[PDB]
């Protein structure tokens, strides 16, 4: 099963949130594929 991204903690910058969104999107894509 595709890796489950870890939720950003305190000090999570917009870029970390964006990257998290892309990783989560990727997880959703790969999950649908799987």
**27: Cβ contacts below 8 Å, ≥ 6 apart:** 2, 3, 4, 5
| Distance of alpha carbon 14 from alpha carbon 22, whole angstroms | 12
Torsion 27-3-32-8 (CA) sign: negative
Of the candidates 20, 34, 18, which has an alpha carbon nearest to the alpha carbon of residue 2?
A: 34
Experiment type: NMR
**Full 3-state SS string of the chain:** CCCCCCCCCCCCCHHHHHHHHHHHHHHHHHHHHC
Q: Give Cα 7 distance to the centre of its chain.
A: 8
């Amino acid at each position: 099963p595709p890796k489950k991204p870890k939720k950003p903690g305190p000090x999570a910058t917009p870029e970390k949130l964006a990257a998290y969104e892309k990783e989560l999107a990727a997880y959703e894509k790969e999950l649908a594929a799987y």
